[PDB]
Design an enzyme around this catalytic site. Structure first.
Site, mmCIF file in Angstrom:
data_model
loop_
_atom_site.group_PDB
_atom_site.id
_atom_site.type_symbol
_atom_site.label_atom_id
_atom_site.label_comp_id
_atom_site.label_asym_id
_atom_site.label_seq_id
_atom_site.Cartn_x
_atom_site.Cartn_y
_atom_site.Cartn_z
ATOM 1 N N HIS A 173 0.799 -1.226 0.000
ATOM 2 C CA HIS A 173 0.000 0.000 0.000
ATOM 3 C C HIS A 173 0.834 1.280 0.000
ATOM 4 O O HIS A 173 0.289 2.352 -0.273
ATOM 5 C CB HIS A 173 -0.919 0.062 1.224
ATOM 6 C CG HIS A 173 -2.100 -0.858 1.181
ATOM 7 N ND1 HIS A 173 -2.796 -1.143 0.025
ATOM 8 C CD2 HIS A 173 -2.737 -1.524 2.175
ATOM 9 C CE1 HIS A 173 -3.799 -1.956 0.305
ATOM 10 N NE2 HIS A 173 -3.783 -2.208 1.603
ATOM 11 N N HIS B 135 -9.236 10.206 0.461
ATOM 12 C CA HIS B 135 -8.379 9.042 0.333
ATOM 13 C C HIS B 135 -7.081 9.241 1.098
ATOM 14 O O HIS B 135 -6.296 8.296 1.232
ATOM 15 C CB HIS B 135 -8.130 8.745 -1.163
ATOM 16 C CG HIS B 135 -7.453 7.436 -1.429
ATOM 17 N ND1 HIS B 135 -6.085 7.320 -1.569
ATOM 18 C CD2 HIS B 135 -7.953 6.190 -1.605
ATOM 19 C CE1 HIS B 135 -5.769 6.062 -1.813
ATOM 20 N NE2 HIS B 135 -6.884 5.350 -1.840
HETATM 21 O O1 LIG Z 1 -3.891 1.389 -1.777
HETATM 22 C C1 LIG Z 1 -4.994 1.977 -1.819
HETATM 23 O O2 LIG Z 1 -5.196 3.181 -1.644
HETATM 24 C C2 LIG Z 1 -6.200 1.091 -2.138
HETATM 25 C C3 LIG Z 1 -6.132 -0.234 -1.893
HETATM 26 N N1 LIG Z 1 -7.196 -1.084 -2.186
HETATM 27 C C4 LIG Z 1 -8.390 -0.642 -2.707
HETATM 28 C C5 LIG Z 1 -9.438 -1.559 -2.960
HETATM 29 C C6 LIG Z 1 -9.253 -2.989 -2.709
HETATM 30 C C7 LIG Z 1 -9.423 -3.514 -1.412
HETATM 31 C C8 LIG Z 1 -9.243 -4.881 -1.137
HETATM 32 C C9 LIG Z 1 -8.877 -5.729 -2.187
HETATM 33 C C10 LIG Z 1 -8.693 -5.227 -3.487
HETATM 34 C C11 LIG Z 1 -8.871 -3.859 -3.784
HETATM 35 N N2 LIG Z 1 -8.681 -3.320 -5.140
HETATM 36 C C12 LIG Z 1 -7.924 -3.972 -6.268
HETATM 37 C C13 LIG Z 1 -6.997 -3.031 -7.208
HETATM 38 S S1 LIG Z 1 -5.654 -3.669 -8.180
HETATM 39 O O3 LIG Z 1 -5.388 -5.040 -7.956
HETATM 40 O O4 LIG Z 1 -5.704 -3.289 -9.542
HETATM 41 F F1 LIG Z 1 -4.365 -2.929 -7.621
HETATM 42 C C14 LIG Z 1 -10.628 -1.064 -3.497
HETATM 43 C C15 LIG Z 1 -10.796 0.298 -3.768
HETATM 44 C C16 LIG Z 1 -9.758 1.199 -3.506
HETATM 45 C C17 LIG Z 1 -8.545 0.729 -2.974
HETATM 46 C C18 LIG Z 1 -7.428 1.666 -2.692
HETATM 47 O O5 LIG Z 1 -7.562 2.862 -2.922
#
Ligand SMILES: O=C(O)c1c[nH]c2c(-c3ccccc3NCCS(=O)(=O)F)cccc2c1=O
Length: 441
Positions: A102, A327
């Site tokens: 993250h 966010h």
């Molecule tokens: O780091 C960050 O700020 C963030 C991290 N997670 C999400 C998620 C999410 C949560 C659990 C599992 C998969 C998710 N999303 C798959 C995206 S991906 O695989 O294409 F990278 C959903 C909406 C926004 C965020 C976000 O903003």
């Protein structure tokens, strides 16, 4: 100003609320430095979009994408980057289940020095469009002269701490950036690094990461005041993990206990949690689609309805951003009348055990699932006993060096009896959003 804490630009607010805000194009502009190479640590990437954010003259300089994707998701990211021969990728190891990469960080190597940017936005258009996001901009760090032996270290230990954070990846592409950081002078840094990395930490490593890292810094570099038990804790986030069947399982035991630490001596401290209501999302600039980035599931929420009595609405009149859904994630320790704060943290870490750590092994081990990163503003690091809260985020206070720009309104406002926390995977079809639409997952 000494804090170098910024919000991202929001499309649709009056210019007075974007003067002093930063778009990604501003951060990467040649006015910030002549780019030689860069590393983009993040969670989600739109590579076509990202390359267009660099100045045209810098678009072929090397870029490293540091991500956590696996399997088909990893294949998709590589496919996104394949047209750009200058882009390399580093897959951060995630050896604990349900962990994620993250951390949101830019390392910007210039002909003139080095800059570190720690922020809260994904590298996709929507995260920089109409959201409230936070940015910390490091000073321009000069290169230490060849042959000169000096630490380049700050009183906050930021240089060693950033290298430590990068060492945890055990990645060859990041050893290169560690060597770059070694060659630069980071002594002017006045923030403390607070990172999370995946693992199970005991003994001499227990205090390195997560909420025990915060606790350690607050013990060592903050002072406890009289009536400290009346100074609230505020947490403000865009996602909520599974915290347990009641507040004693994690939230008000170990997490709040770390957050209320001040000084080295050994609770009714009020705890305010700020998280958008359904109405906040519905009436936002984006409408219900803003809730796509507020991923609180009904499956998680229905197990912890006790938590929602802590929830306060998003309100940000001070920065013109009440309708720009958050966010950013922030944590801070205001005085009982919210006129001062004892510290402020901006971070990628949401309100979850994965991000902050959970104690295991009879309290001897802190287990963290994810990579997270933030910076901590402590009054002692600025020669101060506390920070006065800036009344208007973009205004001109009587002394910027004493006055911290809190980006949302104080005191936080409790949800009303008809308010509900935004839960992203259930429908909302009673009232349309600012674009005329309902929400049907
Ligand atoms: O780091 C960050 O700020 C963030 C991290 N997670 C999400 C998620 C999410 C949560 C659990 C599992 C998969 C998710 N999303 C798959 C995206 S991906 O695989 O294409 F990278 C959903 C909406 C926004 C965020 C976000 O903003």
């Amino acid at each position: 100003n000494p804090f170098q804490f910024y919000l991202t630009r929001v499309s649709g607010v009056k210019p007075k609320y974007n003067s002093g805000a930063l778009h990604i194009k501003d951060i990467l502009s040649p006015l910030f430095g002549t780019l030689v190479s860069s590393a983009q640590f993040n969670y989600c990437f739109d590579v076509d979009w990202l390359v267009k954010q660099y100045p045209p003259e810098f678009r072929k300089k090397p870029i490293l994408l540091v991500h956590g994707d696996k399997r088909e998701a990893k294949a998709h990211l590589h496919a996104q980057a394949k047209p750009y021969e200058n882009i390399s990728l580093c897959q951060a190891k995630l050896d604990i289940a349900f962990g994620t990469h993250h951390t949101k960080m830019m390392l910007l190597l210039y002909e003139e020095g080095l800059r570190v940017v720690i922020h809260t936005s994904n590298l996709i258009h929507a995260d920089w469009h109409q959201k409230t996001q936070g940015i910390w901009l490091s000073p321009l760090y000069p290169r230490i002269a060849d042959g000169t032996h000096k630490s380049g270290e700050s009183p906050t230990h930021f240089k060693a701490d950033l290298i430590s954070y990068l060492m945890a990846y055990n990645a060859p592409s990041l050893k290169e950036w560690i060597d770059v950081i070694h060659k630069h002078d980071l002594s002017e840094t006045n923030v403390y690094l607070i990172g999370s990395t995946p693992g199970r930490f005991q003994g001499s490593q227990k205090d390195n990461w997560g909420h025990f890292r915060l606790k350690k810094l607050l013990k060592d570099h903050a002072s406890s005041m009289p009536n400290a038990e009346s100074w609230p804790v505020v947490g403000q986030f865009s996602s909520v993990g599974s915290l347990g069947a009641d507040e004693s399982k994690w939230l008000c035991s170990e997490f709040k206990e770390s957050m209320l630490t001040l000084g080295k001596e050994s609770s009714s401290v009020p705890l305010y949690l700020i998280y958008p209501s359904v109405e906040n999302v519905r009436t936002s600039l984006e409408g219900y689609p803003a809730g796509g980035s507020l991923p609180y599931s009904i499956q998680t929420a229905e197990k912890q309805n006790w938590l929602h009595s802590y929830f306060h609405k998003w309100s940000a009149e001070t920065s013109g951003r009440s309708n720009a859904m958050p966010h950013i994630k922030t944590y801070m320790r205001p005085s009982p009348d919210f006129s001062k704060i004892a510290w402020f943290l901006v971070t990628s870490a949401n309100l979850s055990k994965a991000a902050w750590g959970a104690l295991e092994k009879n309290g001897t081990q802190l287990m963290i699932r994810s990579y997270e990163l933030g910076v901590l503003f402590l009054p002692s690091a600025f020669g101060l006993d506390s920070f006065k809260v800036k009344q208007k985020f973009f205004a001109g206070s009587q002394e910027p060096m004493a006055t911290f720009p809190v980006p949302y309104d104080l005191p936080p406002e409790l949800y009303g009896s008809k308010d509900r926390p935004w839960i992203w995977n259930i429908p909302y079809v009673k009232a349309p959003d600012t674009h005329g639409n309902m929400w049907v997952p």
